[PDB]
Design a protein around this ligand. Structure first.
Ligand SMILES: *[C@@H]1O[C@H](CO)[C@@H](O)[C@H](O)[C@H]1NC(C)=O
Ligand SMILES: *[C@@H]1O[C@H](CO)[C@@H](O)[C@H](O)[C@H]1NC(C)=O
Ligand SMILES: *[C@@H]1O[C@H](CO)[C@@H](O)[C@H](O)[C@H]1NC(C)=O
Ligand SMILES: *[C@@H]1O[C@H](CO)[C@@H](O)[C@H](O)[C@H]1NC(C)=O
Ligand SMILES: *[C@@H]1O[C@H](CO)[C@@H](O)[C@H](O)[C@H]1NC(C)=O
Ligand SMILES: *[C@@H]1O[C@H](CO)[C@@H](O)[C@H](O)[C@H]1NC(C)=O
Lengths: 240, 130, 107, 240, 240, 130, 107, 130, 107
């Protein structure tokens, strides 16, 4: 899928990228003349008619008047869409400092590893691992340490054409980390739900308890519906 | 289990050239990288060089940057290291160690040498004497 | 060429006592130091592949820690099979180098 | 109101939620035939007429041509609105890691307590406290410690039906914390403005100085006006 | 330009600002009567005609029907634009806590210094420095310390009418810091790309290597194109 | 000021059952929770059990999980504890302590026991002897 | 069942000297430890309701600190009325338990 | 290089008033601020006061808040300090020190005093004796 | 009025040895302390303009560190020209004050 099980800490070559820092002829004649390539449109508000069957000029005016208002809205909408994106660009740049890989994976619509070298972002590709081999461990306790226990679950996996089985630690977005150095002080009554593939593995007291499908846990409805109402298809009736 | 079988002990007269071999069995020889480490008698381990068979990319230590040639034969799944202009100080047990993490995914080089060397070989005792 | 130095040349402890081995570097290895254990006439065996990640098949008593300049290997309890030479290896960038082995011995 | 004075650290039951990870028949006849449920619309560009008073076909074409362009815009606008929300979903998920309660209170349009258990969010409800009882303390300095002083102001309040008066520390969004463990090293010439209800309590040198209404301090104009211009109502005049 | 070389830590007077916390007559007669200021519009769906040349009522209906659907869209679009901005307001407020100057510089479309005093933001103005004098130093290593080296590059500059040359440390958005206390532990094979004006200064091993123009490094395409398709200008043909 | 008045001292023969009462006065008895703590002579405090009158939810220590029954009477605003099969080791000063923070907001249970117990009862000395 | 252990069984200090009591736990109490003071033939009195928050009506000299496994109770100046037994109570989850009281006395 | 030349040594009878001058040469005088620091014999430095000519804003130490008047003459690029009601304890080497960072950008005051004083004057030894 | 206090009144060290001077404050100077060096019959010379920022033309051996209440001045190697009095000055807010200079001397 978009985010397969992968190791994103082996890539040796990253592509360097940078966030961008920097992101009609009407003459009165109340008649107004608008120049078109093959014609000139004369619009009269009092006339309620546009000049390139008396309705022809009215029908032209109807389309032309709606054309102007809609194209003016599309300009105001565009102007604000840009001022919005210029902000979301600053937000993404700030977010990359907090976490680069997740933000860059979003901007690429594909799992990519990202590291920040000075003011540029080095984007590299991850090493995909066999989905079938990936398997989480029931114990989340660090061996030989009761006080310390892995914050995230350990995963046993293998590379595409490699027989050897590696042991790593599951991260976010199905990203396995070869270094199992993610750990936390053991907490009483600690329950954690970790997503691995299409399953959420529930761990109680740093011990696996149950594996539920993603639908088991409700989804936050962040999406803001625009409720776009498409223009209906009206069949005008002939009258007299 | 990936096993690396090295060549046998060879006493070499000074100024001769020795080429120790290391056969990989039980894993992808080309993808992973083999490091050549030398331990002189009563001395600490000394990295000699490392090569990746798929990209034939060989990095050597400055001391042997001129007299050391590490090669790899995919057909025999064997990596061979050659030391030329042998001197008494070259007497040591040469070790072929395979990197723990994959070093190459297709045509893309990986930093698998950052996780150390897991599989080592028996070791070839090379004695330089006349 | 990054230069690594093991703080203790040799360490003698009683069985059950903790043993700490330090490996410092002139530059930053960024959690790419590996700890190895070598016994007389045997090939070195990797204990901690990462700065702190213990390799499989290694007794939990062996533990690693440290980042960049400072690094550390701790043996919770020294046991008769812990008597060996421990070498720290920089894996950040070639030329890779091994720090002088620390001789752990029964006291 | 939306965010009344409340304690959001007592809830024992949280609902678990997860951020979603994964978020026409025209035949040429230059005549083009579009199938409608009760009819077929034939659109001719050269003809400038659409076939379901010669104007009837032109009037149909006018509405139909605007219908196609406006609906194509509403599709392009929708496509981008979605790609935008998929990003704002990643931003909200990243923000929840930095601070879960504020982001989840926004996504619910109501004050809710939120804690992150592994990769799921446990959303619970806060314990409302009597608005009248809530009262801030003038002193913001930890007793018995000159060097250490409360970073945020202490508040004296009481529960809905409970006579007992509790002592807590004011947080953000009118959220009282029973544990007054928020504190900082005392700073020289330190002036802090803290919002409690509909008032901003100015504190100078960790001592209350003045209580001003919210309008006293200017409001940042983050809102990006779309300047939506609604279509004007034109009364077409009859001509001949 | 928008962000000239400047020192934003000298301002003694900041303006205090706060994020806002809180951000038709149709009668059936299937005829529906809509009241206009100078007239009443009667819309018949079955009639397909609107009453304020038989086309006049149809042409009126065409514009009126599109006027209703488009204005209902502009209302749904607006409603969602607002719910979106109410969220982006929370995001900006959270971002200001992480970094105030960058977020406030974005909200002002101009370089401004910002500090958070309690729940209000003190916005001040920066001290511009001569662009010509600004010059980066090749060495990025703290003197007398091999282990410690400046995380960001040092800059030599001078004030508008001040002959004296100051030594500071380049920050983000061409902001020079008089205090060169930004430093990090020296790292092996460390390569950093730092933007100063219209150039990206590459530093290898804490030593300046090359100065490339901004176009040298690719720009991340965060902008989400709306692909706004403006209404085309159709010249209706007269038929019979 | 919330005051909790406990019952008086009662010498009980071994194997008998004692019921110590604790009347709450000056605050909402049902909403808050009362904890029963037992301090044996020359011994440290030992939590016995806790109950919340509104939800009649009673949690007991493992030692008395079988012989201890903590009840609550909203009408008398009194909480009671019954220790059955009394043995000499049961001799102590039983204490009724009300939680500092509210434990219930309507039908919603709250974690008010995380802030400890502010109001304690005078205590009841139960001597188990024949 | 979380197990809490008070580091000092008994502490003796001069009037004016500071006194620190440590209360460790096998798991994480997450800032839910309470400190109490009990005087011979008297009911215990809550001093620090949370890990650090001081209860009202308690001399400011009594301060608390710590989180998770480690917790501490510090009296800035031992005064004649500080001579009592101090018990730390885990409040994270039932069964709630009290740590062995520390007997503070005047030296 | 900004150089600040102070006035010469002046023995003053007790109760007299001394006016020490400090000429700035080689830099803007009004934009920056000059601090007057006094060091009594065998004593540590003691800040007396500071003035910024562009705004004529003078801040004095409490000890001299009443008898100290620090002025600045832009025309002579000279800043002056006047101590009235001189007493034996006033005997010391008065120092004029210019702030390291600019204190004023146009009509906007800046916090240049946060970075200390870089250029110091030679100093003036005022001996108060009869 | 913020009050600053230098921890060491006088420090005697051998040539090559490090020397640390501490300057504490009742309130927070927020990285606005300056370190000066004064030699008999000479004007003071600014060494560290900010808390840790070294002034130009000053031997690198002079380093500064600290923020808020605690501040420190460390000379990596005491040299014959390091024999002087070092004064710390609060620059956070008027009235600006100088801490009692520490007399560094050859031991
Ligand atoms: C309109 O959008 C809102 C969200 O803004 C959604 O809840 C609602 O279901 C949509 N449709 C209707 C019919 O209101
Ligand atoms: C794995 O091996 C197969 C067979 O040789 C090959 O087709 C495939 O490309 C290999 N995959 C990778 C990623 O090396
Ligand atoms: C249009 O929107 C801008 C903000 O994008 C606003 O400043 C302006 O007042 C609005 N109206 C006009 C008449 O431009
Ligand atoms: C539509 O927008 C996308 C980006 O969302 C862009 O890639 C594509 O080229 C656009 N199509 C046009 C402009 O016709
Ligand atoms: C407070 O008491 C009143 C009166 O019984 C009741 O209606 C209300 O719901 C109570 N509020 C609570 C329990 O939060
Ligand atoms: C610098 O001097 C010129 C000439 O007097 C003046 O116009 C300008 O305003 C001065 N600079 C500033 C920033 O005021």
């Amino acid at each position: 899928t978009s985010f397969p099980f992968r190791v994103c800490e082996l890539s040796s070559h990253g592509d360097l990228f940078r966030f961008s820092s920097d992101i009609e002829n009407h003459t009165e004649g109340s008649t107004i003349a608008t120049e078109t390539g093959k014609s000139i449109h004369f619009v009269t508000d009092e006339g309620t008619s546009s000049f390139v069957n008396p309705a022809t000029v009215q029908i032209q005016f109807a389309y032309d008047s709606l054309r102007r208002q809609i194209n003016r809205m599309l300009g105001d909408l565009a102007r604000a869409w840009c001022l919005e994106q210029k902000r979301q660009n600053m937000v993404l740049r700030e977010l990359t400092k907090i976490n680069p890989t997740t933000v860059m994976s979003s901007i690429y619509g594909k799992a990519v590893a990202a590291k920040r070298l000075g003011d540029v972002i080095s984007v590299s590709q991850c090493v995909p691992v066999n989905q079938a081999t990936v398997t989480l461990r029931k114990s989340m306790r660090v061996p030989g340490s009761e006080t310390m226990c892995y914050s995230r679950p350990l995963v046993s996996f293998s590379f595409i054409n490699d027989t050897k089985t590696y042991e790593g630690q599951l991260g976010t977005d199905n990203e396995i980390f070869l270094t199992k150095k993610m750990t936390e002080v053991c907490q009483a009554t600690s329950q954690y739900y970790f997503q691995s593939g299409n399953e959420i593995h529930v761990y109680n007291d740093y011990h696996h308890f149950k594996t539920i499908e993603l639908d088991g846990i409700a989804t936050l409805q962040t999406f803001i519906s625009l409720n776009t109402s498409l223009i209906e298809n009206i069949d005008f009736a002939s009258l007299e | 289990q990936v096993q690396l079988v090295q060549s046998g002990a060879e006493v070499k007269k000074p100024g001769s050239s020795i080429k120790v071999s290391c056969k990989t069995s039980g894993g992808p020889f080309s993808t992973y990288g083999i490091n050549w480490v030398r331990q002189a008698p009563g001395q600490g381990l000394e990295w000699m060089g490392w090569i990746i068979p798929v990209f034939d990319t060989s990095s050597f230590a400055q001391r042997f940057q001129d007299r050391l040639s590490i090669t790899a034969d995919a057909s025999t799944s064997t990596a061979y290291m050659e030391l030329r202009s042998l001197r008494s100080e070259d007497t040591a047990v040469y070790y072929c160690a395979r990197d723990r993490v994959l070093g190459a995914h297709g045509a893309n080089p990986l930093n698998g040498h950052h996780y150390g060397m897991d599989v080592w070989g028996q070791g070839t005792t090379v004695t330089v004497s006349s | 060429d990054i230069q690594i130095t093991q703080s203790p040349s040799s360490v003698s402890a009683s069985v059950g006592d903790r043993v700490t081995i330090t490996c410092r570097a002139n530059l930053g290895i960024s959690d790419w130091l590996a700890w190895y254990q070598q016994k007389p006439g045997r090939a070195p065996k990797l204990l901690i592949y990462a700065a702190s990640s213990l390799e499989s098949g290694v007794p939990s008593r062996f533990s690693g820690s440290g980042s960049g300049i400072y690094f550390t290997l701790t043996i919770s309890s020294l046991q008769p099979e812990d008597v060996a030479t421990y070498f720290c290896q920089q894996a950040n960038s070639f030329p890779l180098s091994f720090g002088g082995g620390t001789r752990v011995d029964i006291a």
